[PDB]
Amino acid sequence: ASKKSVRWCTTSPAESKKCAQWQRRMKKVRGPSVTCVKKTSRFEC
Amino acid sequence: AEVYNKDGNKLDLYGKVDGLHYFSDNKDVDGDQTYMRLGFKGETQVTDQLTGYGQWEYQIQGNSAENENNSWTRVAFAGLKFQDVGSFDYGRNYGVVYDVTSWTDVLPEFGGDTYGSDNFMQQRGNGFATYRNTDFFGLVDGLNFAVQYQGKNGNPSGEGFTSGVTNNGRDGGSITYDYEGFGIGGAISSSKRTDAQNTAAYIGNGDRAETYTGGLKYDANNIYLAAQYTQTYNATRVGSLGWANKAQNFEAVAQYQFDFGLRPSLAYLQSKGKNLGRGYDDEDILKYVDVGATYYFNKNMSTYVDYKINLLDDNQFTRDAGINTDNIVALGLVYQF
Amino acid sequence: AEVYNKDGNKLDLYGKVDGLHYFSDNKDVDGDQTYMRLGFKGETQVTDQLTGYGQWEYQIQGNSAENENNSWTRVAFAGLKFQDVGSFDYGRNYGVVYDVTSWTDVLPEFGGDTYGSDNFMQQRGNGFATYRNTDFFGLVDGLNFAVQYQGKNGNPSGEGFTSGVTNNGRDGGSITYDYEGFGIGGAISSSKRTDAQNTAAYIGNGDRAETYTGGLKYDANNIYLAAQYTQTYNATRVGSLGWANKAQNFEAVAQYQFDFGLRPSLAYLQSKGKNLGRGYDDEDILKYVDVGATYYFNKNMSTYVDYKINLLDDNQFTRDAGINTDNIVALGLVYQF
Amino acid sequence: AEVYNKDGNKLDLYGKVDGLHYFSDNKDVDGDQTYMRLGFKGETQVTDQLTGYGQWEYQIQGNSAENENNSWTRVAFAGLKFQDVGSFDYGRNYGVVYDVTSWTDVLPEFGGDTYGSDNFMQQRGNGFATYRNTDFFGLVDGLNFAVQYQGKNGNPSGEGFTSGVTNNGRDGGSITYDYEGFGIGGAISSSKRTDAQNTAAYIGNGDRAETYTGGLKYDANNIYLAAQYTQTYNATRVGSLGWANKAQNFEAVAQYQFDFGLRPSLAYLQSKGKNLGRGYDDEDILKYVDVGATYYFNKNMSTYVDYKINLLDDNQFTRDAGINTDNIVALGLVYQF
């Protein structure tokens, strides 16, 4: 995370064999900058 | 060859033909590269302190049809070698930054392209006044330094023309130290850059151009080991796209000169473009492992192989800049006098 | 001139200024033709079997205003002379087909024009790797042969670029025999022709380019006699019209070298275009009796007169090709070192 | 340098590098002027009367980027020195008018510019046949004379082409006398001018071009004193404007050559355009005081200072012609072999 913009706060099982381009093509040039910051479930950040 | 040499004054008319071929996927370096150069060196010795001199070196491509002309001037200058004091020479010369970066431009054919020609003072270009001193005035030994000033070489144009001028892919000092093999050497340089090279045509908020450079080498008993590292601000040509805001350039060679004549080299070089303009970002200008060898029949003839294993990917980047990204191999047979 | 020659290695810087003038009705060859050339030869002798070498010849027009530049590279190569084995040399060199067709290119000024430069391997061109052997290995004498391969020298362009390349008026072996005076010699050669040279732009269904050539000469006691006959397929420049599907080239010289200096020549040459394209048909590319002489002051200076009695008519042909069809006379005064 | 020199025949490969800077308001002569030339003189001596010769001199600018080529042919001829008779040489030479006007073109850098290159016979241009005789046949002494003929050097174009031809800023005799220091010389010269040069593009009802010239000089014991006054008709280039219907040119140098090396010069030159075309009228084509000095380290190396104090005003005239009006300074260090 923590280098100026915002997360996409994710989960575990196959759901993100996919969480790609919402980071690159996200960037391609920059766009509204998405990290992700995956993680087992939603009850996160 | 030391031709004339009579009372004080001596000449050395000189040159080589180099029958050189390149295999490459890049059909834009592909194939025949023959070329030649001739040059003269000259010294008249005026006194015992004071001695004059000149040098002229000039390459002429020998890979094209009688249709086509081509060939340019490599070096052309006169100066005076004072005795304790030092030497001075005005003319088309090597930039000082080249005292250290040369530490590693010695591959059979490749290398010495993390900088280029008419590239401020990195390497070779017009209008150099250089001062050189040899063992800090005879008084500490294999310490030396050079300072040099180059006047503006501006527009061919109608706003900042110069007599003898140019487009602008084409508009300092160093000290270096010895104790038998082992060289350290720094060189710092800085150049105001012209308003022509400053125009949102391809790249560079170009204020001065600065290169900062440290080098290392070790040379003795057949081993040649060297490294040069230098980073530049606003001075590394990135294709024909204009220049490179920051760039870190690294280059290391390794070599062994055999008693019978063969002399393998192994080298790494690269150039990392930092914060580039115009999309792009961080991005490699050059990246490649050099592997190759040359063989001396004698000090007058020889052959070489050279093999640039070209470590860069194709991208709207390289492609933009027109930076070759393929491997090449060179094969060369050369005769020099 | 044999300048430097010290321990093994030896140089010969050489050249000539040739004060040349042409009278011709053809105001496009008319008038002042002054030029010069200089070049070096080199040998370094590496062992007793093995010796190195280099040559570089280069002409510079000397007939235009300081305004204008002009002057190209004739020859530039290095190679190795092995001893029984033979020589090898990569470089801009003479095509092999020239081992025999040279048998008749010796007029005081004209001749040597049933073929041209960067004309496949007929004469002179880039990218040649040549092997020559002298008396079929020291063992049968004044029999020799040559084989050579030249690399593609393609487009300047965007489909087939090569490094060092060209428009296309500009994109082999021989054996020859001796018994004192009398040469026979055949040479055969063959070159793939680029897609560029193959395009309904003027002429050639051009698949390969083939020339087939035998020659005869007779030379001893002042008499110089010789003939070279060769027909080519898809390889004789017809004007700037591209190439000539079949062409038959014949060339005979006769000369006598006088004790005191003067050396008359008398020669015929023509070139028969066979089945041409684009109307035209059968048609002569060149046809002319040469009559002329040169006079040696010594082996360093001399004058010549030369007079191509030009036996071709004007027609939408010659005219189309821009082939000169008037006579000319040349008058020259030359000094050579 | 007298390189080769064996049995009769002797060469002299020669040249210089001249590390040369201009400071000038005129950002169009300003800056760096490095350049070099090399050249060869040659004589084979054929008999005791008759001797062969050659000369070729050639400059190559040394003030630009490897990008750029530039460099042209200065002189190129071969002749024959007869013994009582005289010499003859065809080629690219200095025109005879230059026998006398040269009496004053010796500034450390400036001067020699009330005439130009490829400017009829005034100075240097292509196609000169020349005959020169030394002391009116051995038989009156330090009287000689030259007569010379130049062939038309016409259009590159489609009416009047010539072989070796040109735009037109680019399409004779003299006698001179000696009694120890003190020269008078006259030179008279006349050239039919081409239809191309005569066409209401800028200037000259140009029928023949004609220059009439007398000169004075005085030279012995360190003093060098000289003057040359010549007026021309339809033959002084006025900018790029075409020619000057009448013009009087004047030029005087004074110099003293010191024992130790330094050799100041003081000089005046001007050029008075009479009755020009196209408005304009009477008008100075060039006007300036020259002050300057060169210092000889020895006969092989030296520096110079030159300072054109440029006495012309700006006006739609000079400006029209693109004639420089500002001062200039030149600083040079030269080495010559």
mmCIF file of C-alpha atoms in Angstrom, chain A:
data_model
loop_
_atom_site.group_PDB
_atom_site.id
_atom_site.type_symbol
_atom_site.label_atom_id
_atom_site.label_comp_id
_atom_site.label_asym_id
_atom_site.label_seq_id
_atom_site.Cartn_x
_atom_site.Cartn_y
_atom_site.Cartn_z
ATOM 1 C CA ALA A 1 0.000 0.000 0.000
ATOM 2 C CA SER A 2 1.179 3.482 1.490
ATOM 3 C CA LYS A 3 2.727 5.466 -1.550
ATOM 4 C CA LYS A 4 0.029 8.405 -2.421
ATOM 5 C CA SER A 5 -3.550 7.227 -3.952
ATOM 6 C CA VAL A 6 -5.882 4.146 -3.079
ATOM 7 C CA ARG A 7 -6.387 0.343 -2.544
ATOM 8 C CA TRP A 8 -8.623 -2.336 -3.966
ATOM 9 C CA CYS A 9 -8.960 -4.204 -0.443
ATOM 10 C CA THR A 10 -9.591 -7.951 -1.866
ATOM 11 C CA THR A 11 -10.152 -11.761 -0.730
ATOM 12 C CA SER A 12 -8.628 -15.477 -0.914
ATOM 13 C CA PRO A 13 -10.357 -18.253 -3.317
ATOM 14 C CA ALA A 14 -10.143 -17.961 -7.448
ATOM 15 C CA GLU A 15 -11.953 -14.476 -7.370
ATOM 16 C CA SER A 16 -8.639 -12.746 -8.317
ATOM 17 C CA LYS A 17 -7.106 -15.021 -11.049
ATOM 18 C CA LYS A 18 -8.069 -11.814 -12.730
ATOM 19 C CA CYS A 19 -7.250 -8.778 -10.129
ATOM 20 C CA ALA A 20 -4.613 -7.772 -12.873
ATOM 21 C CA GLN A 21 -5.408 -4.700 -15.164
ATOM 22 C CA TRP A 22 -7.056 -3.040 -12.037
ATOM 23 C CA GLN A 23 -3.245 -2.172 -11.374
ATOM 24 C CA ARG A 24 -1.663 -2.332 -15.112
ATOM 25 C CA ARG A 25 -4.060 -0.859 -18.012
ATOM 26 C CA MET A 26 -5.157 0.766 -14.807
ATOM 27 C CA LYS A 27 -1.580 2.162 -15.344
ATOM 28 C CA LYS A 28 -0.949 2.421 -19.205
ATOM 29 C CA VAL A 29 -0.448 5.635 -18.723
ATOM 30 C CA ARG A 30 -1.368 6.142 -14.915
ATOM 31 C CA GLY A 31 -5.362 6.275 -14.589
ATOM 32 C CA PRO A 32 -7.260 6.737 -11.055
ATOM 33 C CA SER A 33 -4.307 4.685 -9.402
ATOM 34 C CA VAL A 34 -5.315 1.255 -8.015
ATOM 35 C CA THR A 35 -3.138 -0.869 -5.835
ATOM 36 C CA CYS A 36 -5.438 -3.869 -4.691
ATOM 37 C CA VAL A 37 -4.042 -5.045 -1.264
ATOM 38 C CA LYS A 38 -5.816 -8.498 -1.679
ATOM 39 C CA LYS A 39 -6.609 -10.609 1.612
ATOM 40 C CA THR A 40 -8.956 -13.692 2.580
ATOM 41 C CA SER A 41 -12.262 -11.432 2.831
ATOM 42 C CA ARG A 42 -13.809 -7.949 2.832
ATOM 43 C CA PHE A 43 -13.791 -7.113 6.831
ATOM 44 C CA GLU A 44 -10.260 -5.345 6.034
ATOM 45 C CA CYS A 45 -9.026 -1.657 5.874
#
